[PDB]
């Protein structure tokens, strides 16, 4: 996808600040309920890096559930330039 | 002439005024392609304007589009009709038939 850098950073920071992302399968919703970003943007940034790994997705009645993995925590630490003590919220 | 208004007054009557002398459907719709003049005037006189194409079959004939040639879409093959004062108050789609006559 071709998404703004700041919007991708908003999604990335919510992901490695809460641990889980729940996005409705609606590729036209203007705003994500939790994140001030396009729902399409959230969904596709995850159909993105969840494919390299770093996350696990479950569909479950038109509602994607993404959960971080260990490689996810490491990669997002590197991405957001965070010190190696800020564990995800789920920890 | 329309219902109590001659052609001369019609040609000068603005859409808003004309609506008041029009049946229930059209005036309710008004209570709820302006390039036409660009072919009405930007064309040689004593002749007809160039056709202006549109998909809007639900456009009501007002006495502002009188004289213009409109290519109405009926799903394919824009059909050119000349807006005449008898068309007033009718939908654009009433003059571009959507189907082919069966002819068993």
């Amino acid at each position: 996808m071709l998404m703004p850098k700041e919007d991708r950073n908003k999604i990335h920071q919510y992901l490695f600040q809460e641990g889980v992302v729940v996005a409705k399968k609606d590729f036209n919703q203007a705003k994500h309920e939790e994140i001030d970003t396009k729902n399409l943007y959230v969904i596709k940034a995850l159909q993105s890096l969840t494919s390299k790994g770093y996350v696990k997705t479950q569909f479950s009645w038109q509602y994607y559930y993404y959960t971080l993995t260990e490689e996810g925590v490491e990669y997002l630490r590197e991405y957001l330039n965070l010190p190696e003590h800020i564990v995800p919220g789920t920890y | 002439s329309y219902r109590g208004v001659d052609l001369e007054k019609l040609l000068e009557m603005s859409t808003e005024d004309f609506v008041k002398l029009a049946p229930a459907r059209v005036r309710r719709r008004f209570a709820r392609m302006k390039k036409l003049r660009a072919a009405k005037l930007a064309a040689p006189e004593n002749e007809k304007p160039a056709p202006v194409r549109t998909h809007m079959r639900n456009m009501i004939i007002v006495p502002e589009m009188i004289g213009s040639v409109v290519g109405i879409y009926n799903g394919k093959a824009f059909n050119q009709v000349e807006i005449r004062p008898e068309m007033l108050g009718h939908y654009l789609g009433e003059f571009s038939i959507t189907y082919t006559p069966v002819r068993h």
């Binding site: 036209n28 009645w61 038109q62 | -």
Partner: protein, 53 residues
């Protein structure tokens, strides 16, 4: 482009869908179920709908 990429979907069959399978046809809109008739048959016992008579 993005301006003309959605027409009104505020009503009619295209506004709503099954909350399970996102199908537009056969929807159950009673009591706010908003479930396809087939999905409702599949998970009627989970919701609390049972056959007695």
């Amino acid at each position: 482009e993005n301006v003309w990429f959605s027409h009104p979907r505020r009503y009619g069959k295209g506004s709503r869908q099954c909350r399970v399978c996102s199908s537009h046809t056969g929807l159950i809109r009673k009591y706010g179920l908003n479930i396809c008739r087939q999905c409702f048959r599949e998970k009627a016992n989970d919701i609390g709908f049972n056959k007695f008579r």
